[PDB]
Amino acid sequence: SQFTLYKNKDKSSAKTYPYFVDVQSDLLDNLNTRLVIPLTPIELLKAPSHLCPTIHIDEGDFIMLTQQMTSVPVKILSEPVNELSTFRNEIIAAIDFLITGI
């Protein structure tokens, strides 16, 4: 669901990418894939700033790695934990930065 934060259930990738955010429109939720963006802990790191928004939340301080955006099977969204709706503008702007350079 759009802007919902999900726990990464893969033990292999959980250390550098604890969480990911769903950025796909809810109007397309019959697709069996989801476009998501990984979050990486700031401690495991400066980031390009306009590309990689800094996320201050209850789970901690993260950098959203927009450039590692990728589509995944919907099945890996089994564990929702939070939501990032108040970051909507920052997220959409970062995505625009990656694609339009605007």
Partner: protein, 131 residues
């Protein structure tokens, strides 16, 4: 298959709702732009968009079509839409207006929004006829 069309009905209504807001905005372009330019932030612009009634203008006849009532999502409060004789937007409609790219204001892209909203009204009636 029945679950499929119930699903398509739900999404067609949500989609028609967003498009309806865009059609209203694009019929009030001057006043929409002035309001956005005057707002310090996108949040304040959003609040200005939803906190006033909008004149239906050139799209009055389109929004009053018979099949407009059926195209309304079930989560929509009665407060939203036309309250005589102006249109009150939702946060979701406001957000979509703020995210419009400028090239959407060209004649062809404006027409596509209106054509698509109309096509949806017909699609919504068809899905219901299927149930």
């Amino acid at each position: 298959m029945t679950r499929r069309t119930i699903f398509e009905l739900r999404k067609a209504r949500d989609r028609a709702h967003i498009l309806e807001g865009l059609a209203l905005a694009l019929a009030n372009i001057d006043e929409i732009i002035e309001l956005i330019k005057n707002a310090p932030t996108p949040a304040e612009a959003k609040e200005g968009l939803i906190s006033r009634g909008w004149d239906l203008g050139n799209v009055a006849s389109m929004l009053e079509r018979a099949g407009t009532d059926a195209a309304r999502p079930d989560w929509l409060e009665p407060e939203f839409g036309i309250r005589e004789g102006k249109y009150f937007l939702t946060e979701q409609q406001a957000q979509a207006i703020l995210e419009l790219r400028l090239h959407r204001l060209t004649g062809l892209e404006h027409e596509k929004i209106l054509d698509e909203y109309k096509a949806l009204l017909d699609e919504i009636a068809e899905l219901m006829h299927i149930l």
